[PDB]
Design an enzyme around this catalytic site. Structure first.
Site, mmCIF file in Angstrom:
data_model
loop_
_atom_site.group_PDB
_atom_site.id
_atom_site.type_symbol
_atom_site.label_atom_id
_atom_site.label_comp_id
_atom_site.label_asym_id
_atom_site.label_seq_id
_atom_site.Cartn_x
_atom_site.Cartn_y
_atom_site.Cartn_z
ATOM 1 N N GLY A 1 -0.987 -10.985 9.730
ATOM 2 C CA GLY A 1 -2.418 -11.176 9.963
ATOM 3 C C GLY A 1 -2.993 -12.419 9.309
ATOM 4 C CB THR A 2 -6.274 -14.131 9.703
ATOM 5 O OG1 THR A 2 -7.264 -13.122 9.471
ATOM 6 C CG2 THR A 2 -6.007 -14.248 11.200
ATOM 7 C CB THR A 3 -5.654 -15.780 4.559
ATOM 8 O OG1 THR A 3 -4.381 -16.343 4.903
ATOM 9 C CG2 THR A 3 -5.731 -15.599 3.043
#
Ligand SMILES: [Mg+2]
Ligand SMILES: [Mg+2]
Lengths: 243, 241, 240, 231, 250, 195, 244, 235, 111
Positions: A29-31
């Site tokens: 996933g994204t940060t």
């Protein structure tokens, strides 16, 4: 073999492989990050701009629970929404019976027990998110991060998603330079900076920055999205610091 | 071989999921120890906060189950908190139904029964934790009862749990061979906490700072945990010995 | 509750549990139905290895569903009891609400519906039973004979057979049953029904059951000696 | 491979194969386009027939006076999801005298879809949806995937060969987002977009399906001779 | 969630075996020896306390349990399975008998209820059989003294004397040489101690052995006086001292 | 509805039941047959609350017919009466009980005897030489107490029945419109068309 | 989910048999032989205990022969615990009938219901079948003395003489050879004991390896008595028929 | 094994695709819609000559204005027909009108995917649903166990459907009379059937606005078969 | 004791001509001897050229109209936007009313 085909099975070394595979979805996933400050907490997330066709400012990821708690997560987005919905039911039920808004440690355990419940049976799969959350209660500010196993702890700073390693290194330096404390306003700026540094590990597409905060002095202990001028100021501080 | 995946018998009459649950118990690499005094019961557990980003005050494997009962867990924190919440519910319900505080041994039996059920019903997995309950029971005096993933439980003079349990166990065995009694002969829980820390130091062969331990104490009508400061006071006293 | 879909489709579009239910029917003892001009006769095979059997009490293979309708079968005996009981209940329920006994087609449609239901419900297997249902509708003298199977399809027959070696006796009926001139009497009809079983049976002894049904609730099971008279007559006629 | 037997199983790399197989039915479906200006939102869809004797399957479904959607994939799953939407739109009006926000419709669809991706016995929905509407904050276009992911966009497309239309809308964005108060020019822009997904087949009178919603425009569907205007 | 295991986990194999019951009996084979002997005026049940740790207090763990005032139980195999069977056994004695007839069940009928509970763990959905064999000793007015064995399948048999677990084959052979219909309770106890010594390699005394009797009514254990027709429990656990007193006369 | 009588003589049970059906101020029907054949040698007459009488009688008839088919055997009159009593005793503690009183007349072919059972709506069963439900017993029991003999023929039973019906027609306030009379014996059930 | 561990106890094989019923019958073929013989004036049930021990308490022991009511008994072959579940169900069923009709339950009616219960476990529910075959011996006033058997499929049949358990093929041949219709109870007693003697896998048939019972008209006219034999009474009848 | 509601890697439901295979094995059914009515015809296919063929019931009335023909596992159709009849009658009760043909078909198609671990499997039968209503006139629908339904001017289903549909593609035109459609159904069934088509192994039916749904006598059909062999003989 | 009904007064009037129809009603709403409103509409356009009034207890009247309006909406959804004829509306309203046969809407309805 086959110990990893079904949730809640122990392997011969005591592991639950399905939960470890759920962690892979999170790492994909994204940060997202959280920073704890003197009288509150700050949350920030990387939103990948898949295409110009996405309406800017209109796919909000950070979610509110009750009036004093913010949540952000990395991994399978729908799993995150499911978890926040449950959190909102838990907060409403607590408030209903006890009058006071749910304390953050209490809220942390409600989510923890529910995420842990999905590691007990083969008829469900684990959550494919790690969630960072917190807010202000009667005892001050609290920041938590919750894994697919149901494991959670309190944090000075927290990170998860694809750029977590860079963010963690960056959060550790923050905690060192500012040992007596960080204000809610420097924490907002620093969150922008850290997401920007963390975005190098995702340099492919460019991104949109989302920030939220709860602070006793700055937001009256209520969760608010950082918008307009204050966000633009945070974007500038981040830009100036990478170069 | 799907007899290895759920709690049914293998051809040698073994329950492999129960055995593997015993192995999850050591994943945290923490060691705990419990001892009884004249008037108190003490439990100590190692504390490890490797990540600097953690709030160390929220890192704990000791739980206040009721006003009289404490619990230390060896095993992953999610399963530990599951066991703790259930025990809190059971202890409170018992007081409501029967009009007196649930004894330590009775809670232990109840929790061991729930665990037995997980070893017999297919849809539930065992919890990969060992639970050490302590109190000063109004009938039995100082009490230590420990529960495991097989649904087994028993009372102890003293006990130890974790990867380095045997080192601590034999150290304690050798002490009670000398003293020939069932407990630490001491009035103050302070000196019993000092005995417990002293014998963990000598058995593991490691020194402890105030942030390296967490301590729980049961006395008559209350169980409580020590702050880092209370522990430091305890460490100072040991150094002057 | 137990929910598993046991009857499901396979890649070639077949439902194997229903087809394996048919194999159970093939292993069952042979049963035959022949309709005359004013009667229906149901004949059944009884296995040859069952001596020391007490015939006073052992479950007869032909069952009255009501006073004007009968049912026989081939397949699992225990399974057939469940279908017979339901049919009996439905027949009484029909009289209670409609104030008229079931038609033979209605009764057949009920049993076949129950059979079909068990091919697409969770947690159950199909019935290992095929039935022959025979009788007369209220105030009607036209004989009726229907067949049902595990899948739940049913249809009407001039004459039909089910169970083991039914291929052989169907062959016999197809070249001995004239549709333009059906067996004109009870004697004629029974004789053709016994002739057809002697193709497959062994002995004309207790190895053949025969139930005759006539219009207006006139149903009777034949005795060993009466059946044995028919067998004796057929043997002597085949000496050319 | 060993991990695609059901929805309740992660693969060793953290994937959900049954959800990905559901996403594949969307790719086999006929192309449909959505796009919006500040005053109107438009759907365009290419309908598919069985053979020359058959009708052309309808792709567009009305959910309320101010909201509707188009589909690509399992059409019965669209019927189930659009029915749920219709009830949710209807509950909002009866109980709160309030027109359901398009963003809220998106969240409700996401949560409904997600429940079928985490429990045994279920299966994911096998359909993608493009929701358009006009609410208290203006025009909106949403994209729904049966993974649960809902996105708000200026324009998009789903179904086979939708990458052509998607590329076109990405190049044309600055122009079509400004077609305000001119419903006919916005539709023409959507028909241009969908033409970039055509190979061999072309747009005919019983082939094309168009819908629009806007400032003073109830969600309405045009088929047959009513779309001749645009071919 | 929902328990979705609504199907049997014990099923017949092609040879006719019920695998899970066989494997449960193998768990019983590996368990510590226990035995029972019936005399003219009582019954004795005995077993070794195989303590797990020296730091454990072995009298906080009882292998011999009172089920009713005149009925006791011991086991071999899985202890936790035994502990929950005793809970259910004590309870079913009340719900299905005492609360109906106002008196405790006769030994054979309580055994029968335990047996049923064990049979059901062998057929019901989503469970395994119990991994224990019980010896249940008791007394009732119209049947006298009795001793029963209950196995993981739910089967139960009446015995004059028997042994189960580890060294049961040798212990049964030892018991056959010694048993007769004229044994008094003290003789049965003495034989019980002799038989058990053969299977214990370690220490053998009042603290490592657990032994109980069904014998005479104990009015001193009743707790009250006044009702002359209530005479007290026939079940009695022998103390460490009482066992040691009998090991000198061994 | 109103009157049901029964008398068991030597070799048969005779049941007599009134023919009127009366709603409010109008006699709606003067040829009503308040009886159901339960089996070839068992007859049940009934009286009580409207709707419930026939609903109960037909439900019983359906169950006994189901039994007969399943076992290829006729239940004894004692067995039928016990089954009927259990249904009524079950019903009296229901949400809405059957308000029905019945007489059961049967010939037991195994014992070669007639039998008469009287069962009220509470499930109160007794076997009697003669019986009645409602107010009809208040006039007819004393007649039967005087005249009845255990060895009477069927014809003597019918004459004794004539005395009862005559007394009722003289002293009862209501016009019950005569009775339908049925005889149950070894040959089954038949209706006496001239009474 | 749980589908992985389901054996599917109620499906057909490709040949159209029920595996679990077949395998349950294979289990029963190893159990002690039980024999039933019907005569004009009574019924005999005789059964072999599976290799006993000298320490077993025989007089208070019951593994083969059970009483359902005053007129009906059963001999068991298979898992005893499975049989006790069914026996208690049958005892209750008999009492429900008595309560409803005020008449003792006809033998076939009790047999049919027990067989329907077994049948149910082969068609729905996904549970293992009962590993039990029964011989029913009883009397009623419709058919007089009756013998039936039921097995795990829930199929039942009536017999003049029948065996279940081990060596039924050999036992059934021996019964067929010597049985006759005009045979009396005391003749059937000798036939049952001699058939067990020839078929047994034991060294020799002795009183301690047997359970024995009769259902007789023997009493005060038109009334039926069930005698379960005590061990000494079995010992006597073994000498009195010249087997020991 | 695997779940009953499993998608394949190509995005198709295994059980639904397999049920389509069972339908290919079914006896042939043909429907043709005209402006004078819709004709429905079927191949009976008696499995033995002792089977009384008029008990083969593959054309069915749903309401006066709606008929239906079936192909595949035809026992599966009975509960679908029952639902359709109930839906048509219930609609008339709630609304004092005839229910539209398409609404009826949609109601039947809603049953299709209600299977899982609801019924244990999809239906193994396809239906042709023909009818008339005031808004859309004469209509023919193909209802499948996938839950999908298409409207058709002409449609064949069952084992002879590939060859029959190719023939309908040439022969159908918007001006067909009803009599021409009847003959055309007979002609195409004659082509694809294994045995020689007569009035006992094939059956006709139609729905007109005026007279509603009718299943033709064997004598009426016999006349129409004779008329057809005479047409073909004349060139 | 709680009484779930009240009475809000009002009178309504419907008349049919050859090619038209009217539905009239006063706009006063009352309880007991008090006026709640001098203008509270009581007759409603329900779509499809149908007007409706449900007069008596106003809470029940409003509930019924709301349910009928909702029924017109779903009639369009479920039957391809077919117009609901007045005879069909009438039959639908009968089922809405009789559905509460044992706890009635206290209204006199006219369409
Ligand atoms: Mg388990
Ligand atoms: Mg009475």
């Amino acid at each position: 073999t086959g110990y990893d085909l079904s949730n809640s099975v122990f392997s011969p070394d005591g592991r639950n492989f399905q939960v470890e595979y759920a962690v892979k979805a999170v790492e994909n996933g994204t940060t997202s990050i959280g920073i704890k400050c003197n009288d509150g907490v700050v949350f920030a997330v990387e939103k990948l701009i898949t295409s110009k066709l996405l309406v800017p400012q209109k796919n909000v990821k950070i979610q509110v629970v009750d009036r004093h708690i913010g949540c952000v997560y990395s991994g399978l987005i729908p799993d995150g929404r499911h978890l926040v919905n449950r959190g909102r039911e838990e907060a409403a039920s607590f408030k209903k019976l006890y009058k006071t808004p749910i304390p953050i440690p209490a809220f942390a355990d409600r989510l923890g027990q529910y995420v842990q419940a999905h590691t007990l049976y083969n008829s469900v799969r684990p959550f494919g998110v790690s969630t960072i959350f917190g807010g202000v209660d009667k005892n001050g500010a609290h920041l938590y991060m919750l894994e697919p196993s149901g494991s959670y702890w309190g944090y000075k700073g927290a990170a998860t998603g694809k750029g977590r390693q860079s963010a963690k290194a960056e959060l550790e330096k923050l905690v060192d330079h500012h040992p007596e404390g960080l204000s809610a306003r420097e924490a907002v700026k620093q969150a922008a900076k850290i997401i920007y540094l963390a975005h190098e590990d995702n340099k492919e597409k460019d991104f949109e920055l989302e920030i939220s905060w709860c602070s006793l002095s700055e937001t009256n202990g209520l969760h608010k999205f950082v918008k307009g001028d204050l966000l633009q100021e945070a974007i500038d501080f981040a830009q100036k610091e990478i170069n | 071989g799907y007899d290895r995946h759920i709690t049914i018998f293998s051809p040698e009459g073994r329950l492999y999921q129960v055995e593997y649950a015993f192995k999850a118990t050591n994943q945290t690499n923490i060691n705990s120890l419990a001892v009884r005094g004249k008037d108190c019961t003490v439990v100590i557990s190692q504390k490890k906060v490797p990540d600097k980003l953690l709030d160390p005050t929220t890192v704990s494997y000791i739980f206040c189950i009721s006003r009289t009962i404490g619990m230390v867990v060896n095993g992953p924190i999610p399963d530990a908190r599951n066991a703790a919440l259930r025990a809190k519910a059971e202890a409170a319900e018992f007081r409501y139904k029967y009009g007196y505080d649930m004894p330590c041994d009775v809670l232990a039996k109840r929790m061991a029964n729930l665990s037995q059920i997980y070893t017999q019903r297919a849809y539930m997995r065992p919890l990969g934790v060992i639970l050490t309950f302590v109190s000063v029971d109004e009938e039995l005096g100082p009490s230590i009862y420990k529960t495991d993933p097989a649904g087994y439980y028993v009372g102890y003079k003293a006990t130890a749990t974790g990867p380095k349990q045997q080192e601590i166990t034999t150290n304690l065995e050798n002490h009670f061979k000398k003293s020939k009694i069932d407990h630490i002969n001491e009035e103050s829980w302070e000196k019993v906490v000092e005995f417990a820390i002293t014998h963990m130091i000598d058995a593991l062969g490691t020194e402890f700072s105030k942030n390296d331990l967490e301590v729980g104490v049961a006395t008559k009508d209350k169980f409580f945990t020590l702050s880092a400061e209370n522990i430091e006071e305890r460490l100072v006293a040991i150094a002057e010995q | 509750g137990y929910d598993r879909a046991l009857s499901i489709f396979s890649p070639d579009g077949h439902i194997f549990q229903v087809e394996y239910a048919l194999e159970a029917v093939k292993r069952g003892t042979c049963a035959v139905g022949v309709k005359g001009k004013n009667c229906v006769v149901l004949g059944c095979e009884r296995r040859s290895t069952l001596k020391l059997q007490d015939t006073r009490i052992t479950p007869s293979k032909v069952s009255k569903i009501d006073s004007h309708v009968v049912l026989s079968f081939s397949g699992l005996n225990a399974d057939s009891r469940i279908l017979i009981e339901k049919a009996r209940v439905e027949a009484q329920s029909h009289r209670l609400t409609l104030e008229d006994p079931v038609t033979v087609e209605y009764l057949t449609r009920y049993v076949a519906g129950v059979q079909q239901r068990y091919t697409q419900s969770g947690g159950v297997r199909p019935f290992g039973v095929s039935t022959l249902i025979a009788g007369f509708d209220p105030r009607d003298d036209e004989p009726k004979l229907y067949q049902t199977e595990p899948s739940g399809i049913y249809s009407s027959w001039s004459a039909q057979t089910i169970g083991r070696n039914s291929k052989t006796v169907r062959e016999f009926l197809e070249k001995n049953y004239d549709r333009k001139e059906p067996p004109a009497t009870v004697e004629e009809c029974v004789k053709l029904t016994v002739r057809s079983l002697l193709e497959v049976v062994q002995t004309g002894a207790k190895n053949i059951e025969i139930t005759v049904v006539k219009p207006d609730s006139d149903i009777v099971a034949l005795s060993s000696e009466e059946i044995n008279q028919y067998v004796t007559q057929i043997e002597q006629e085949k000496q050319e | 491979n060993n991990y695609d037997g059901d929805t309740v199983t992660f693969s060793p790399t953290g994937r959900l194969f049954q959800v990905e197989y559901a996403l594949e039915a969307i790719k086999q479906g006929s192309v449909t386009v959505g796009l919006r200006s500040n005053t109107h939102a438009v759907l365009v869809a290419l309908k598919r027939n069985a053979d020359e004797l058959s009708s052309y399957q309808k792709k567009i479904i009305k959910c309320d006076e101010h909201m509707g959607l188009s589909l690509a994939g399992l059409a019965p799953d669209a019927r189930v999801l659009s029915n749920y939407l219709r009830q949710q739109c209807n509950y909002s009006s009866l109980v709160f005298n309030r027109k359901l926000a398009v963003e809220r419709a998106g969240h409700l669809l996401c949560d409904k879809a997600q429940k079928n991706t985490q429990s045994y016995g279920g299966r994911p929905y096998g359909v993608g949806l493009l929701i358009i509407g006009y609410d208290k904050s203006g025009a909106h276009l949403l994209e729904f995937q049966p993974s649960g992911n809902v996105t708000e966009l200026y324009g998009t497309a789903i179904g086979a060969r939708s990458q052509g239309a998607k590329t076109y809308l990405e190049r044309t964005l600055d122009t079509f987002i400004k077609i305000d108060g001119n419903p006919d020019e916005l539709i023409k822009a959507g028909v241009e977009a969908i033409s970039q997904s055509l190979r061999d087949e072309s747009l005919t009178v019983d082939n094309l399906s168009i819908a629009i919603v806007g400032k003073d425009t109830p969600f309405t569907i045009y088929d047959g001779e009513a779309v001749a205007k645009y071919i | 969630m929902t328990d979705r295991y609504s199907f049997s986990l014990t099923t017949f194999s092609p040879s006719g075996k019920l695998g899970q019951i066989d494997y449960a009996l193998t768990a019983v084979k590996q368990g510590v020896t226990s035995l029972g002997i019936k005399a003219t005026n009582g019954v004795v049940i005995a077993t070794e306390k195989k303590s797990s740790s020296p730091l454990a207090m072995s009298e906080t763990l009882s292998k011999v349990s009172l089920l009713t005032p005149d009925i006791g139980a011991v086991y071999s195999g899985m202890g936790p399975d035994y502990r929950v069977l005793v809970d259910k056994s004590r309870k079913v004695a009340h719900t299905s008998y005492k609360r109906i007839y106002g008196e405790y069940p006769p030994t054979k009928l309580l055994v029968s209820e335990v047996a049923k509970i064990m049979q059901e763990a062998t057929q019901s959905g989503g469970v395994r059989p119990f991994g224990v064999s019980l010896l249940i000793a008791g007394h009732d007015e119209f049947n006298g003294f009795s001793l029963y064995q209950v196995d993981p399948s739910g089967s139960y048999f009446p015995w004059k004397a028997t042994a189960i677990g580890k060294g049961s084959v040798a212990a049964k052979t030892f018991l056959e040489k010694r048993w007769n219909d004229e044994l008094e309770l003290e003789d049965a106890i003495h034989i019980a101690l002799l038989t058990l010594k053969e299977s214990v390699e370690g220490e053998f005394n009042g603290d490592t052995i657990e032994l109980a009797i069904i014998g005479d009514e104990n009015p001193d254990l009743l707790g009250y006086t006044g009702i002359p027709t209530d005479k007290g429990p026939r079940f009695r656990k022998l103390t460490s001292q009482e066992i040691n007193d009998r090991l000198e006369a061994l | 509805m109103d009157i049901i009588l029964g008398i068991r003589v030597q070799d048969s049970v005779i049941l007599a039941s009134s023919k009127a059906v009366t709603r409010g101020i109008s006699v709606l029907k003067d040829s009503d047959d308040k009886t159901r054949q339960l089996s070839p040698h068992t007859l049940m007459s009934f009286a009580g609350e409207a709707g419930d009488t026939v609903q109960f009688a037909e439900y019983i008839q359906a169950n006994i017919q189901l039994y007969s088919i399943r076992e290829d055997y006729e239940l004894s009159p004692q067995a039928v009466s016990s089954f009927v009593r259990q249904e009524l005793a079950k019903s009296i503690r229901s949400r809405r009980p059957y308000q029905v009183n019945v007489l059961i007349g049967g010939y037991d072919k195994k014992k070669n005897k007639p039998e008469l059972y009287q069962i009220d709506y509470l499930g109160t069963k007794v076997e009697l030489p003669y019986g009645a439900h409602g107010y009809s017993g208040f006039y007819t029991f004393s007649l039967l107490d005087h005249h009845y003999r255990p060895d009477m023929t069927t014809e003597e039973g019918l004459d004794l029945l004539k005395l009862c019906v005559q007394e009722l027609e003289k002293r009862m306030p209501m016009d019950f419109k005569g009775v339908i009379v049925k005889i149950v014996d070894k040959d089954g059930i038949r209706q006496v068309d001239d009474f | 989910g749980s589908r992985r561990y389901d054996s599917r106890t109620t499906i057909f094989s490709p040949e159209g048999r029920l595996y679990q019923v077949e395998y349950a019958l294979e289990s029963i073929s190893h159990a002690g032989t039980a024999i039933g013989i019907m005569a004009s004036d009574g019924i005999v049930l005789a059964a072999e205990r599976k290799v006993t021990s000298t320490l077993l308490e025989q007089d208070t022991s019951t593994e083969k022969l059970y009483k359902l009511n005053d007129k009906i008994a059963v001999a068991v072959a298979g898992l005893t615990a499975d049989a006790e579940i069914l026996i208690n169900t049958a005892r209750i069923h008999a009492q429900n009938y008595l309560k409803t009709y005020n008449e003792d339950i006809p033998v076939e009616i009790l047999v049919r219901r027990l067989s329907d219960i077994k049948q149910g476990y082969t068609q729905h529910g996904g549970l293992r079948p009962f590993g039990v075959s029964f011989i029913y011996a009883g009397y009623d006033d419709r058919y007089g003395y009756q013998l039936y058997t039921s097995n795990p499929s829930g199929n039942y049949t009536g017999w003049k003489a029948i065996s279940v358990g081990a060596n039924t093929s050999a036992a059934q041949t021996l019964l067929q050879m010597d049985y006759k219709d005009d045979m009396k109870v005391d003749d059937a007693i000798e036939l049952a004991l001699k058939t067990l003697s020839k078929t047994t896998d034991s060294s020799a048939l002795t009183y301690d390896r047997l359970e024995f019972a009769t259902i007789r008209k023997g009493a005060n006219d038109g009334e039926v008595y069930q005698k379960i034999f005590k061990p000494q009474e079995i010992k006597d009848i073994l000498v009195k028929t010249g087997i020991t | 094994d695997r779940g009953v509601s499993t998608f394949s890697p190509e995005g198709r439901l295994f059980q639904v695709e397999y049920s389509l295979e069972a339908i290919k094995l079914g006896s042939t059914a043909i429907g043709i819609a005209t402006k004078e009515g819709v004709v429905l015809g079927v191949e009976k296919r008696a499995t033995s000559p002792l089977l009384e063929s008029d008990s083969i019931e593959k054309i069915v009335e749903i309401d006066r204005h709606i008929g239906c023909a079936m192909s595949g596992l035809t026992a599966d159709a009975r509960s679908m027909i029952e639902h359709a009849r109930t839906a048509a009658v219930t609609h008339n009760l709630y609304y004092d009108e005839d229910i539209n043909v398409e609404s009826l078909t949609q109601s039947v198609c809603d049953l299709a995917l209600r299977f899982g671990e609801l019924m244990s499997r999809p239906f193994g039968v396809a239906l042709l649903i023909a009818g008339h209503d005031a808004d859309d006139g004469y209509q023919l629908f193909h209802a499948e166990p996938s839950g999908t339904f298409y409207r058709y001017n002409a449609k064949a289903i069952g084992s002879g459907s590939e060859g029959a549909q190719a023939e309908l593609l040439n022969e159908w035109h918007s001006s067909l009379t009803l009599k021409e459609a009847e003959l055309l159904v007979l002609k195409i069934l004659k082509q694809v059937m294994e045995e020689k088509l007569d009035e006992n192994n094939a059956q006709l039916s139609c729905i007109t606005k005026q007279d509603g749904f009718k299943i033709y006598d064997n004598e009426k059909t016999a006349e129409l078969i004779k008329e057809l062999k005479e047409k073909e003989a004349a060139e | 004791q709680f009484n779930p009904y009240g009475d809000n007064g009002g009178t309504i009037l419907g008349i049919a001509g050859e090619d038209f129809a009217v539905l009239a009603g006063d706009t006063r709403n009352i309880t007991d001897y008090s006026i709640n409103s001098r203008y509270e509409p009581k007759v409603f356009d329900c779509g499809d050229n149908i007007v409706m009034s449900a007069n008596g207890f106003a809470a029940d009247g409003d509930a019924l109209v709301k349910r009928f309006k909702n029924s017109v909406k779903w009639y369009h959804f479920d039957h391809n936007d077919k117009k609901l004829s007045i005879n069909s509306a009438a039959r639908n309203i009968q089922h809405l009313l009789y559905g509460k046969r044992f706890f009635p809407y206290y209204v006199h309805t006219i369409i």
